Amino acid sequence: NEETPFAPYVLSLGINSNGTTTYYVVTAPELMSGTINAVAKGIEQNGYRDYEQAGQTVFSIGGLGLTSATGIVRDANGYLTERGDFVFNSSLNAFTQMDGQNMIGLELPNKESGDQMTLYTVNISDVSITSQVKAPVFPLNQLEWPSITGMCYSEGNVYVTYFPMNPSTFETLYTDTTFVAVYSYPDMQFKTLMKDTRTGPAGSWNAFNGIFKVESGDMYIMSNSAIANGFSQSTKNAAFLRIPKGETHFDDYYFDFETVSGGLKPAHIKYIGNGLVFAEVSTISPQTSADRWGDKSLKCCIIDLNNKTVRDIKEIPVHNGDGGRRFAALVDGGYVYRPVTASEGTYIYQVDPQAATAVRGAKVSTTFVGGFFRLDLE
Structure with missing residues (x-):
């Protein structure tokens, strides 16, 4: 066994x-040097898996x-182990934290x-x-069957972002409206269908990028309408909107990302804190049908929601994304640490979000990285 006990990452x-x-x-044990690999270490997991953390549990979905979803936790000996089993019926379209003790899954x-x-x-x-x-x-299927792009819990309301998509032709013919469906927890009675016309639907296919919560409890949505991330058409500029904590309307916030970035569309986003978002941003402009699903040629940026700015992280090479996960x-x-898979191989890059600069770190012997966490002992 080559696992280092209590290695945090x-x-x-x-x-x-x-x-x-x-x-x-x-x-x-660290992210800045050495080579991370699965030689004589690791929990082998077969089949398709995606990963989400809450508290000190990593869910292997x-x-x-x-x-099923399986827990991964750190045992008292410092080694990772599998814990528990949550069986669902077919697919877990969305999964988000409700409180310190509970997830909700749709x-x-x-x-x-x-x-x-x-x-x-x-x-x-x-x-x-x-x-x-x-x-x-x-009414998630009022226009066409929904494709779910995120879910959030706020003050007893459940918020679901989605876009309509014909499941057999994959057509996304409805791109002029942001849709957020709102339900009451725990009974899931329908509360309201939020609509907004300043941008398009929130999120993209199986990308879990439609909605996120910030320190205040407010939520933001991200619309990209990106053909490269699965849409069949694009009609409105990529943008962020805001839903006030526990409320069921969009407020006056509007961030025209597509024009600020010079015509680009975000692909993947992670809230950092203090109004900052780490993003992979497509460099293809305009995206066309020839780009569809490819998630190609992304750069890394810091997005500042407070100041509505975009700053390129110039030390991270342009690279292809991981698509819908x-x-x-x-x-x-x-x-923020991000494995960047490019022609030289895969390296972790350490990003300073205030300066929007990166330092290259450890090499990773892998095809791609499917999940990246810090797991402490509870």
């Missing part, structure tokens, strides 16, 4: 061998056939796959379903 290394992607959840049933969706309440420390409730899909970026010790 957790990386899920996605490694392509003979066509198949296998995940190795490894730890690293199975996909493409796998219908699962859709097309219109023939069922009529009701399910909200699961999952205990973080036990990794187990505490309660579950059913709700109609409508969660953004593997780690906010740690006042920096």
Whole structure:
């Protein structure tokens, strides 16, 4: 065993061998030198996995056939171990933290796959379903079947960002409206369908990038309408809007990202703190049908929501994104760390968010990084 006990940093290394992607959840004692790898260390996880952290639990969420999420925690000996099992029916369309002890997870049933969706309440420390409730899909499918891009909990309301998409043709014919559906917790009664016409739908296909909460409890949405991230068309400039804490309207905030960036669209976002967002931003302009789904040629930027500015991190090379999955970026010790997979290989880059400058760190022997966390002992 080459695992270093109590090594804080957790990386899920996605490694392509003979066509198949296998995940190795490894730890690293530091991020700035050495080589992070899965030689003689790691929790091997087969199948499609994506990763989300809450508290000191990393959830390994199975996909493409796998219908469970598994906890990963640090045991008292300093080693990672698997803990618990949350079984769902088909796919976990959204998953977000409700409070210090609980996640909520939303699962859709097309219109023939069922009529009701399910909200699961999952205990973080036990990794187990505490309660579950059913709700109609409508009005999420009023125009077309929804494609869910995020979920947030605020003061007893559940907020769901989505865009309509025909599940068989993949057409996204409705891009002129931001949609946020709002439900009451715990019963999932429908409260309101928020609409806004200053930008397009929030988030993009399976990218978990539609909505996020900041220190005040306010929420922001991100619209990119990006063909490169899965839309079939684009009609309105990429932008951020804001929902006041616990409320059900958009306020006067509006950040025209697309014009400030000189015509570009964000692909992936992570809130850093203090109004700053770390982002991968497509350098393709205009994106066309030839770019669709590719998530190619991204740069890294700091987005300042307070001042409505965009600053390029010039030391990070242009690189292709990981597509429709969660953004593997780690906010740690006042920096943001991002594995950058490019022609030279994969390296962790340490980003100073105030200066918008980066330092190259550890090399990572992997195909891509599927998750990136700091896990302490509880």
